[PDB]
Curated annotation (Swiss-Prot):
EC identifiers of the protein: 1.7.-.-, 1.11.1.-
Binding site for heme b: 93
GO biological process, one term: removal of superoxide radicals
Start and end residues of each Globin domain: 1-147
Subunit annotation: Monomeric.
Name of this chain's protein: Myoglobin
Keyword match Repeat: no
Native source species: Physeter macrocephalus
Gene Ontology molecular function: any one: oxygen binding
Group of enzyme by EC: oxidoreductase
Keywords: Cytoplasm, Heme, Iron, Metal-binding, Muscle protein, Oxidoreductase, Oxygen transport, Phosphoprotein, Transport
Record family assignment: Belongs to the globin family.
Length: 151
């Protein structure tokens, strides 16, 4: 459970991500794909991308980035009450996309990395801890649905 003050830190920084959702999505996905190239392999739509410059140039990548960040934004603003948001995301990612829970840890590290680059003054260690906690809650709840489904 996050405190209200921890939720506030999380949503203050997220309100800023929301000023340039596409730009954040690019940075986060490039970071993910470069740090963890196995993750790129899950996306038939992106597996032709072989350089950072190709990734930066992809309009569809930027579009998909907005998709993921939008779904995340919606979850975070539930401040833990995200059952309705997670159940379809858990089903498709476990059963259709085949995304290990570990990959959700990887994208969480990428989000934190980028948030830290772009919003130092609104993402000190306190807000980093709160964001960590929120992302772990999301993972924990997803993992429980994976285990139900036998993934």
């Amino acid at each position: 459970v996050l405190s209200e003050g921890e939720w506030q830190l999380v949503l203050h920084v997220w309100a800023k991500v929301e000023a340039d959702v596409a730009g954040h999505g690019q940075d986060i996905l490039i970071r993910l794909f470069k740090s963890h190239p196995e993750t790129l392999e899950k996306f038939d739509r992106f597996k032709h991308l072989k350089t950072e410059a190709e990734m930066k140039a992809s309009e569809d990548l930027k579009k998909q980035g907005v998709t993921v960040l939008t779904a995340l934004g919606a979850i975070l603003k539930k401040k833990g009450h995200h059952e309705a948001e997670l159940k379809p995301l858990a089903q498709s990612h476990a059963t259709k996309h085949k995304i290990p829970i570990k990959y959700l840890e990887f994208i969480s590290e990428a989000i934190i990395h980028v948030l830290h680059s772009r919003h130092p003054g609104n993402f000190g260690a306190d807000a980093q801890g709160a964001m960590n906690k929120a992302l772990e809650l999301f993972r924990k709840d997803i993992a429980a649905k994976y285990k139900e489904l036998g993934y």
